[PDB]
Amino acid sequence: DNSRYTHFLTQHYDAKPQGRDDRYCESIMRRRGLTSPCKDINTFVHGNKRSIKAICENKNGNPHRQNLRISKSSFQVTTCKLHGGSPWPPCQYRATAGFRNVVVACENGLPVHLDQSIFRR
């Protein structure tokens, strides 16, 4: 299909975040349907879509590892990390805002996966 890109946007894209504190994470993780069960860690990329899609080409990306592409430019991002002992709501999240390049996988010139490993830090 082409729904994997749409799904990437739902899970990992927020053009203009409001605050990027804990409450930001707790709200958007709900809004985007990521709390049943609670996703343990999830990162949102900010800014415009075109820069992110550009990672899929030489314009803003380099091949990376075995199935991945890494951006040349840095993005504002926010990482939401699950807090507390339970996998189930209420989902408490700690927010970590950051600014760096991102790793994705691309299909047909569109990002379809965000590599969360670089934000487990």
Side-chain angles (χ1 to χ4, degrees):
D1 228 338
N2 194 257
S3 53
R4 289 88 183 326
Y5 167 63
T6 297
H7 200 39
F8 174 88
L9 296 180
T10 298
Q11 296 188 301
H12 300 296
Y13 177 74
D14 189 21
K16 293 169 176 55
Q18 313 175 88
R20 304 153 69 183
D21 63 347
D22 289 6
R23 280 271 215 177
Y24 166 78
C25 282
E26 288 160 6
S27 176
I28 197 186
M29 289 296 287
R30 279 186 273 161
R31 207 174 317 131
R32 303 302 182 83
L34 296 172
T35 55
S36 67
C38 309
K39 195 163 184 284
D40 182 78
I41 187 176
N42 191 78
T43 301
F44 294 90
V45 180
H46 313 303
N48 61 236
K49 289 176 186 182
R50 58 177 188 277
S51 290
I52 304 175
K53 301 148 77 168
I55 306 163
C56 300
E57 8 173 343
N58 175 250
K59 191 176 177 184
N60 197 27
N62 296 133
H64 177 79
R65 261 56 269 198
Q66 24 246 317
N67 23 321
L68 305 177
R69 294 192 54 82
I70 188 159
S71 75
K72 294 181 179 182
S73 75
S74 304
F75 297 77
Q76 289 287 343
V77 294
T78 307
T79 294
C80 302
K81 197 279 167 58
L82 187 61
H83 164 85
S86 178
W88 299 99
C91 307
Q92 301 175 91
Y93 285 102
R94 258 68 159 112
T96 302
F99 176 68
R100 68 111 95 212
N101 61 347
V102 304
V103 175
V104 302
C106 298
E107 273 191 293
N108 300 324
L110 303 172
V112 285
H113 167 74
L114 184 76
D115 176 13
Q116 284 295 166
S117 70
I118 70 169
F119 301 110
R120 311 206 198 87
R121 300 163 188 183

